[PDB]
């Protein structure tokens, strides 16, 4: 890395089962200048302004009788207050109606993108989470990622 700026661009582990597990051990994935990946979270090495972003890709085939609530959130876990606060949040509800008894379950796809500039403190933890890993689609590269850059 030629830059002096704290960076991260972590990606979903394609081999992980029923979870969104962030990885830096892949090609085109970053973790430099103090940024750490500890308990599936990005650790802020120094105070400043950070551009924080994340994308998830949801997939399903057909629709169940139940309504599907799909969330994606980036949250801040402070070193001082110790509390978890949502910085960036989005929701999607893909299923208008239950797939008819004999109709072919046609595959649906729902991407979610979150991104913004935040003032963060040294030691702060950033979490990019989803509520339904059964709907998560990390089967191919570039589909689900989480990153930060000090500005």
């Amino acid at each position: 890395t030629p830059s002096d700026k704290p960076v991260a661009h972590v990606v979903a582990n394609p081999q992980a089962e029923g979870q969104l597990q962030w990885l830096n051990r892949r090609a085109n994935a970053l973790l430099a200048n103090g940024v750490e990946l500890r308990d599936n979270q990005l650790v802020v090495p120094s105070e400043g302004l950070y551009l924080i972003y994340s994308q998830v890709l949801f997939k399903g085939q057909g629709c169940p009788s139940t309504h599907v609530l799909l969330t994606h959130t980036i949250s801040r876990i402070a070193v001082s207050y110790q509390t978890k606060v949502n910085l960036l949040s989005a929701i999607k509800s893909p299923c208008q109606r239950e797939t008819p008894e004999g109709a072919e379950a046609k595959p649906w796809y729902e991407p979610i993108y979150l991104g913004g500039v935040f003032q963060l403190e040294k030691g702060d933890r950033l979490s990019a989470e989803i509520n339904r890993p059964d709907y998560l689609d990390f089967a191919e590269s570039g589909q689900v990622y989480f990153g930060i850059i000090a500005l």
Partner: nanobody
Framework: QLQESGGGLVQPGGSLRLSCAAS?????????????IGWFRQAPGKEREFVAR????????YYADSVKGRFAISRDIAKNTVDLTMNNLEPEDTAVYYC?????????????????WGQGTQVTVSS
């Protein structure tokens, strides 16, 4: 709770469809987010190995490297069955094939992650 059907003999390069039906408590009713259904296989004197997984809710799948592209795990909502369409069969695919379920989302494809199992079905790939 789980019962496998299909199976038996097939010529190498042939196709076979296995089915896993849920008896008593159907896959449609779960306490959790969904039922996770897995297909496993055990060749004689070899450890039970993962083949494919499907979530009953989403229909999202995972395949073992040696079956990816030739096997397809599907969920027949209407017939409350989990199917495994196996193509491009080869003699070393001969094994007893097992259906396994979990009312929830496992964090592993380990045999230990599933509690409920079907009795198994023999699949024999030979001339």
């Amino acid at each position: 709770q789980l019962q496998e059907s299909g199976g038996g003999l097939v010529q190498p390069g042939g196709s076979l469809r296995l089915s896993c039906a849920a008896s008593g408590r159907t896959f449609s009713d779960h306490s959790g987010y969904t039922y996770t259904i897995g297909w496993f296989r055990q060749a004689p004197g070899k450890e039970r190995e993962f083949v494919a997984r499907i979530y009953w809710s989403s229909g999202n799948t995972y395949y073992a490297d040696s079956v990816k592209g030739r096997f397809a795990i599907s969920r027949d909502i209407a017939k409350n069955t989990v199917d495994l369409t196996m193509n491009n069969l080869e003699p070393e695919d001969t094994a007893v094939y097992y259906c396994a379920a979990r009312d929830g989302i496992p964090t592993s494809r380990s045999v230990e992650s599933y509690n409920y199992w079907g009795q198994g079905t023999q699949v024999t790939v030979s001339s």
